[PDB]
Amino acid sequence: CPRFLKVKNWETEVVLTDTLHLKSTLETGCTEYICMGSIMHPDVRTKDQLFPLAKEFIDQYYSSIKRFGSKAHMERLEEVNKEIDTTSTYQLKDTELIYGAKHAWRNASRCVGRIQWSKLQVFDARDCTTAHGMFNYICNHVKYATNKGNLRSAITIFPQRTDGKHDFRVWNSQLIRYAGYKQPDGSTLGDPANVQFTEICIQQGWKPPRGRFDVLPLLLQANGNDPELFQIPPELVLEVPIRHPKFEWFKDLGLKWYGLPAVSNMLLEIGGLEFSACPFSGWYMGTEIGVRDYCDNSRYNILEEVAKKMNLDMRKTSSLWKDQALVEINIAVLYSFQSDKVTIVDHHSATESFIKHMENEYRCRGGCPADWVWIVPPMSGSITPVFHQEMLNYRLTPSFEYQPDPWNTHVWK
Amino acid sequence: RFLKVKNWETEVVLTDTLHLKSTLETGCTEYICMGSIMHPRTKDQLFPLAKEFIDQYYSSIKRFGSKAHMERLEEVNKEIDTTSTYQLKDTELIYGAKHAWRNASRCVGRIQWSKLQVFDARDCTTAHGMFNYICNHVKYATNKGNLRSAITIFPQRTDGKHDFRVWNSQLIRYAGYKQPDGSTLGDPANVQFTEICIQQGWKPPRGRFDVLPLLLQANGNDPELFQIPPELVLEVPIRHPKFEWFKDLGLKWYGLPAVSNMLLEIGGLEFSACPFSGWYMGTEIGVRDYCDNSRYNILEEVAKKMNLDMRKTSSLWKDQALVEINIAVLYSFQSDKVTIVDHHSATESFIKHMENEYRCRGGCPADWVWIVPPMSGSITPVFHQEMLNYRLTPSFEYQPDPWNTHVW
Numbered sequence: 001c002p003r004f005l006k007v008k009n010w011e012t013e014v015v016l017t018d019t020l021h022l023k024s025t026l027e028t029g030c031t032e033y034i035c036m037g038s039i040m041h042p043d044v045r046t047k048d049q050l051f052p053l054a055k056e057f058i059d060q061y062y063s064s065i066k067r068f069g070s071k072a073h074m075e076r077l078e079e080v081n082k083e084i085d086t087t088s089t090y091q092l093k094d095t096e097l098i099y100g101a102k103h104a105w106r107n108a109s110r111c112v113g114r115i116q117w118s119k120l121q122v123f124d125a126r127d128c129t130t131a132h133g134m135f136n137y138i139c140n141h142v143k144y145a146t147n148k149g150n151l152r153s154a155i156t157i158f159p160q161r162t163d164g165k166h167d168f169r170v171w172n173s174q175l176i177r178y179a180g181y182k183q184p185d186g187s188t189l190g191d192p193a194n195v196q197f198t199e200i201c202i203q204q205g206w207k208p209p210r211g212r213f214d215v216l217p218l219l220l221q222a223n224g225n226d227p228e229l230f231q232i233p234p235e236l237v238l239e240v241p242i243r244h245p246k247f248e249w250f251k252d253l254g255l256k257w258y259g260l261p262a263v264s265n266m267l268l269e270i271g272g273l274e275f276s277a278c279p280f281s282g283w284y285m286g287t288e289i290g291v292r293d294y295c296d297n298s299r300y301n302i303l304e305e306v307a308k309k310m311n312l313d314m315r316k317t318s319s320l321w322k323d324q325a326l327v328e329i330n331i332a333v334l335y336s337f338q339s340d341k342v343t344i345v346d347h348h349s350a351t352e353s354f355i356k357h358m359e360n361e362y363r364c365r366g367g368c369p370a371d372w373v374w375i376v377p378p379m380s381g382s383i384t385p386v387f388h389q390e391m392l393n394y395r396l397t398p399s400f401e402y403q404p405d406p407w408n409t410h411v412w413k
Numbered sequence: 414r415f416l417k418v419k420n421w422e423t424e425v426v427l428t429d430t431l432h433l434k435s436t437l438e439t440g441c442t443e444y445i446c447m448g449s450i451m452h453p454r455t456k457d458q459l460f461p462l463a464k465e466f467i468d469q470y471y472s473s474i475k476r477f478g479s480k481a482h483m484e485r486l487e488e489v490n491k492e493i494d495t496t497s498t499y500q501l502k503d504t505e506l507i508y509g510a511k512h513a514w515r516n517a518s519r520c521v522g523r524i525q526w527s528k529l530q531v532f533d534a535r536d537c538t539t540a541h542g543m544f545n546y547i548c549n550h551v552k553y554a555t556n557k558g559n560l561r562s563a564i565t566i567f568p569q570r571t572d573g574k575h576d577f578r579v580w581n582s583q584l585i586r587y588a589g590y591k592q593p594d595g596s597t598l599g600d601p602a603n604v605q606f607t608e609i610c611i612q613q614g615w616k617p618p619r620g621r622f623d624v625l626p627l628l629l630q631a632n633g634n635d636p637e638l639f640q641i642p643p644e645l646v647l648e649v650p651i652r653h654p655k656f657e658w659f660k661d662l663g664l665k666w667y668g669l670p671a672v673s674n675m676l677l678e679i680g681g682l683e684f685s686a687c688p689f690s691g692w693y694m695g696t697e698i699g700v701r702d703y704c705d706n707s708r709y710n711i712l713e714e715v716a717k718k719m720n721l722d723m724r725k726t727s728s729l730w731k732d733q734a735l736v737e738i739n740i741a742v743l744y745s746f747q748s749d750k751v752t753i754v755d756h757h758s759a760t761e762s763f764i765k766h767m768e769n770e771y772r773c774r775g776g777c778p779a780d781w782v783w784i785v786p787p788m789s790g791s792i793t794p795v796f797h798q799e800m801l802n803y804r805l806t807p808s809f810e811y812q813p814d815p816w817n818t819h820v821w
């Protein structure tokens with residue numbers, strides 16, 4: 001690998017130089033003969049595996065606070081090494097945990113929102129022992145992050161993995177999501193994405209209202225025990241009914257969505273340590289709701305219904321009736337959130353901010369890993385600046401990772 | 414290993430074995446992906462490449478290891494020995510050109526790959542000859558609006574000092590002019606090429622949509638200017654089926670997209686002039702040509718006529734105007750009976766093509782970054798389709814612009 005890799009923006013002709021890729025730690029899935037850039041996803045660490053991973057991270061941390069090679073750095077190194085040697089693992093200091101979480105976000109190549117990476121409230125939940133305790137921590141997170149509509153990014157970090165048989169897990173994919181119900185006739189009520197999880201909740205004892213927008217209960221696993229069900233207090237769940245500034249009929253569609261996107265099924269990796277329960281939240285880019293949640297054929301799938309209300313010619317694809325309806329739905333989502341003073345960002349503003357962030361990162365850090373396939377929004381790609389921006393994708397640690405769904409691996413007691 | 418690609422909407426899983434055939438580099442490594450980067454002979458080099466190609470050709474016609482196949486290899490080897498190169502048979506040229514298209518990972522139009530009219534222009538020696546061949550291509554491909562895919566192939570590279578080149582990036586394009594007030598008139602993408610034409614004696618009309626002359630280089634000589642006969646240049650005035658004011662924008666485009674600056678590589682041989690043409694997908698014109706900030710950049714004017722509120726981005730005024738412009742382009746071509754395909758129909762055909770290719774070929778190299786359309790991405794099926802990208806030969810390649818190489 002050459003020391004300097006250059007990226008060009010084809011619209012501005014700006015050329016940036018990447019050196020940070022030299023710090024890449026993991027595989028992308030690509031090789032010199034194949035690219036897997038559009039592939040969605042292309043037992044514990046031993047003492048000897050853990051040693052260099054910890055040192056790599058501790059070095060990175062002390063370099064970041066301008067104390068590299070200091071007495072405190074050398075002492076922390078020795079202390080960590082001693083701990084790994086005597087206990088097969090180690091515990092992060094609060095400072096290091098905070099640094100690690102912010103950097104996992106900073107390193108998330110798929111995230112367009114990273115200009116915000118240094119403003120992340122970190123909740124240390126490593127003292128948690130029970131599902132009830134996890135419930136308490138999660139409620140506090142939701143309330144803090146929601147902030148009456150003035151959303152604040154946050155992460156709550158539960159105890160790290162030990163032997164792999166005592167994992168903390170949030171079984172939910174996001175803290176707040178809507179149930180989906182498969183009907184005897186093959187139709188689906190609610191969110192089809194969530195049918196499997198909904199069925200699991202029902203089996204565990206959840207009594208479902210069986211509506212279109214039912215907030216799912218939390219299914220929480222502490223210390224490897226069987227997961228337990230909890231209802232999020234509804235006053236903590238901020239929702240926005242969707243209406244359109246021109247179309248008075250849009251409200252009659254009965255759509256709404258929740259304000260807080262809070263992904264809860266990822267794994268946070270810091271210094272070789274694995275935090276299998278680390279729910280984090282930011283705020284929405286409008287297209288996540290207006291394009292994907294509402295218009296994906298396998299999701300709420302509303303294009304036809306909206307197009308019919310718009311009196312559109314739906315006989316030919318070339319009338320672009322779908323595209324026309326898609327825009328109006330996204331206008332409505334943004335309009336409804338702004339009207340209710342719930343933080344949201346449009347895809348133009350978000351990508352423009354991301355470009356500035358990327359330029360700053362190249363300047364101060366020597367690069368910014370970015371996954372074009374994910375960064376470019378799902379509508380109007382080329383009229384956003386990110387479409388024209390060459391990117392380099394690579395994996396830096398600390399990082400957020402995918403992990404298997406817990407019902408697939410859980411040993412029921 | 415066999416690699417699986419999944420469609421996340423349909424849950425269809427395909428199995429790729431074809432990638433195992435590639436030997437050319439992608440640009441990525443195990444540690445860095447360059448998937449969004451635009452651009453990541455000798456006798457000794459020549460024979461194995463030739464052999465590789467002759468082998469797959471005789472395999473494709475189910476006569477691998479035949480007397481014909483063996484005689485051909487023997488023939489090619491002697492020819493490389495005694496002349497430092499070799500000449501393709503007509504059958505081989507056609508097979509190779511079709512497969513370069515078939516292997517073009519960035520092309521969403523590949524369901525048409527085996528329907529390609531190949532014009533053999535390897536006997537051409539002068540720019541005048543090049544002009545004749547190109548006029549014939551344009552006339553055949555245009556076909557009064559019923560567009561037909563075609564490629565015209567000029568003599569291959571010999572020593573690199575006698576290249577045939579079409580200096581135009583496409584056979585038909587619009588001039589761009591830098592103005593005193595620092596603005597650009599016409600297509601800003603073509604400002605440089607336009608200046609070269611002017612320098613060489615082209616008298617510019619200095620309008621918004623002036624069809625550029627052809628600038629043609631034969632056998633490494635200085636390029637020469639030619640005017641395409643205007644009756645051969647099919648154009649479409651853009652109007653809108655609802656907005657009667659849209660025609661007042663004075664917009665038009667040409668019907669024939671004919672890319673002329675790529676290099677066609679077959680069996681180690683390099684065809685530096687190989688203009689090829691198909692037909693448009695509407696977004697090429699309506700989104701990129703018309704709405705790129707660096708191109709005609711019409712969103713603001715259009716949004717004005719639509720009386721949209723343009724104070725805040727979150728009104729999505731850009732997205733609204735964008736859809737209407739793309740409706741106009743499709744409507745206009747269709748009303749004039751000029752072949753064009755919308756991004757919905759095109760991507761749908763591409764998914765079917767992928768399925769065909771996995772079934773009969775073991776895979777289909779595809780570049781998601783290029784395949785997904787520049788508007789309404791996730792409401793087309795390719796957005797949800799995992800793709801594998803790898804490099805197969807015969808292929809179309811980029812080459813440097815001739816004005817950065819040519820000594821006059």
Ligand code: HEM
Pocket residue numbers: 101105108110111112113114116120153154155280281282283284285288345350374400
């Ligand atoms: C502050 C506002 C934020 C915005 C506007 C934002 C925006 C986005 C968007 C639009 C995506 C693509 C999601 C999809 O299409 O499914 C994404 C992905 C991602 N975000 Fe951000 N994000 C924000 C905050 C955060 C925070 C606070 C974290 C972690 C601390 C984070 C970590 C990630 C990760 C790891 C991904 C990749 C997800 C995956 O691969 O499934 N983001 N972000």
Ligand code: HEM
Pocket residue numbers: 510514517519520521522523525529562563564689690691692693694697754759783809
């Ligand atoms: C017949 C109808 C066709 C359609 C609708 C079509 C569609 C497209 C589109 C939309 C692109 C993206 C181009 C861009 O965004 O600049 C593309 C790329 C490409 N097409 Fe096709 N195409 C067609 C025929 C052909 C033919 C006949 C050939 C060659 C014989 C071809 C070879 C290529 C190549 C090499 C690329 C990649 C261009 C690059 O890398 O710059 N296509 N196609």
Ligand SMILES: Cc1ccncc1CCCNCc1ccc2ccc(N)nc2c1
Pocket residue numbers: 040113261263281282283284285288421
């Ligand atoms: C996991 C999966 C598999 C197949 N299809 C779709 C998915 C969903 C992708 C999950 N990632 C969603 C995600 C993650 C982090 C986010 C952070 C902020 C934000 N606004 N949205 C996010 C959205």
Ligand SMILES: Cc1ccncc1CCCNCc1ccc2ccc(N)nc2c1
Pocket residue numbers: 010451522670672690691692693694697
């Ligand atoms: C030339 C260039 C330089 C820098 N960045 C970007 C580019 C754009 C690449 C141009 N490719 C255009 C192209 C190629 C083949 C096509 C075939 C059919 C068709 N309808 N359009 C095509 C359009």
Ligand SMILES: C[C@H](O)[C@H](O)[C@H]1CNc2nc(N)[nH]c(=O)c2N1
Pocket residue numbers: 037038039040373374375421796797798799800
């Ligand atoms: C096949 C493809 O990789 C897949 O559909 C991806 C494309 N890009 C994406 N980009 C974002 N932001 N979110 C997604 O879910 C996806 N899905």
Ligand SMILES: C[C@H](O)[C@H](O)[C@H]1CNc2nc(N)[nH]c(=O)c2N1
Pocket residue numbers: 010387388389390391448449450451782783784
């Ligand atoms: C940076 C990025 O690679 C570049 O803008 C690409 C993105 N995808 C594209 N896709 C198509 N079809 N055509 C293009 O010119 C581009 N440009």
Ligand SMILES: [Zn+2]
Pocket residue numbers: 030031034035036037441445446447448
């Ligand atoms: Zn790659």
